[PDB]
Amino acid sequence: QVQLVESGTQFRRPGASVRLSCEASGYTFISSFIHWIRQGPGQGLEWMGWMNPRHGAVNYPRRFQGKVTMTRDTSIDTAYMELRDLRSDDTAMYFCVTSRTKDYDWDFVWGQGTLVVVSSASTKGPSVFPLAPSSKSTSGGTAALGCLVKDYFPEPVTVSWNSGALTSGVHTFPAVLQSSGLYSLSSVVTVPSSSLGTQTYICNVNHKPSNTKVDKKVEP
């Protein structure tokens, strides 16, 4: 089986550099080119360059020249791509790639991907704010309530409602990475407005990277 195994997710501060490795197995490493590809969050694929394992020959697209460097350790069959002068928009998933087809370098077998997050942030627990139910958040006999989990780093956080008793109508949205370098997300749930009087709603936010746990009662 052809396999490319890349390094774990990296966290860097703007201006720093990142070095990514790609371990090849299941084929003759020298035989085919190694490419690197990046995916912006919620975005398409972008080719970064190719490298010849045999002698280190390199080809880069116009955009990445002088910001990317591709190298190689033949003795261990491992490829490298180093990225420098990292910017917030360098936050993406990076893939080392090789071509299975003989005589052609463009049909790809993909590595699991390496997320590189460029942020000046340091690990930080979230602030948890209630999204109160009101006249504004009530349609038919249905009300909506939720939690704002703002300014935490890094991913992930887990959100449950009433310790897991409430799951139907719950929506936990994908985190957004803000310009501050911190993440933010919201979690909502829709409930019968009739229950606002009696049933208590508690959101449970757990952020393991900072051992932060917060139970927030959401009242009308």
């Binding site: 398409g44 694929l45 972008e46 080719w47 697209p61 893939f95 299975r100 087809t101 052609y104 463009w106 049909d107 790809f108 077998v109 993909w110 590595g111 699991q112 991907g113 602030s127 704010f129 209630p130 999204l131 109160a132 009101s134 504004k136 958040s137 349609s139 249905t142 909506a144 939720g146 704002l148 703002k150 929506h171 936990t172 949205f173 994908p174 985190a175 957004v176 803000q178 933010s184 997300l185 919201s186 909502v188 829709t190």
Partner: protein, 206 residues
């Protein structure tokens, strides 16, 4: 060369035939790859040389075309086929087509949330708009403060297609300062979705 894909989004029922189109500007292409990518995972090679299947790929997948136009087709959609598809020519990829499982059109339930008193203490005020259980995915959210159009101070996020009822939900967050928040009165998000005959506006008075 440039590759343009269609449709941007593809909404089909299970068991239906599906066709994805990729067009090449240069006009001289005999080699073309297709890929499938699912949320949170690496791409997987499906087709290369336009019409050739990768080993281990189901017979329902076929590719065709010569010159400028190429197509990726699924004979009978399997629930496992629901994902983002990419075509490729050399270093260039198409924008990607997201196969989405179709449900009858449903209009969003729109909810709006004022900033918490607790957040105001921080010095920043967040206004939140919820777009609940809607289909199709395409939805437009506009933020208005005292009827003034907001731009670039909102961020939004969308859930994956719900496995039970196949709707989507959207959260839009309007971010203001405490001071700016208190300099104005009326806060409103305007929702446009094809399931709504005209835009629905949810608002509140500070």
């Amino acid at each position: 060369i440039q590759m343009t894909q269609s449709p941007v989004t593809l909404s089909a029922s299970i068991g239906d035939r599906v066709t994805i189109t990729c067009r090449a500007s240069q006009r001289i292409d005999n080699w073309v790859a297709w890929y499938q990518q699912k949320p949170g995972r690496a791409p997987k090679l499906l087709i290369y040389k336009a019409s050739i299947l990768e080993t281990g790929v189901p017979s329902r997948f076929s590719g065709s075309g010569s010159g400028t136009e190429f197509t990726l087709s699924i004979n009978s959609l399997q629930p496992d086929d629901v994902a983002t598809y990419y075509c490729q020519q050399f270093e260039e990829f198409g924008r990607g087509t997201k196969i989405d499982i179709k449900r009858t059109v449903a209009a969003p339930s729109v909810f709006i949330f004022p900033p918490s008193d607790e957040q105001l203490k921080s010095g920043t005020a967040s206004v939140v708009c919820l777009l609940n259980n809607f289909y199709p995915r395409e939805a437009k959210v506009q933020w208005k403060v005292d009827n003034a159009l907001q731009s670039g101070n909102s961020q939004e996020s969308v859930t994956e297609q719900d496995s039970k009822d196949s709707t989507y939900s959207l959260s839009s967050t309007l971010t203001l300062s405490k001071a700016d928040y208190e300099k104005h009165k009326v806060y409103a998000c305007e929702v446009t979705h094809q399931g709504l005959s005209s835009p629905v506006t949810k608002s509140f008075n500070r």
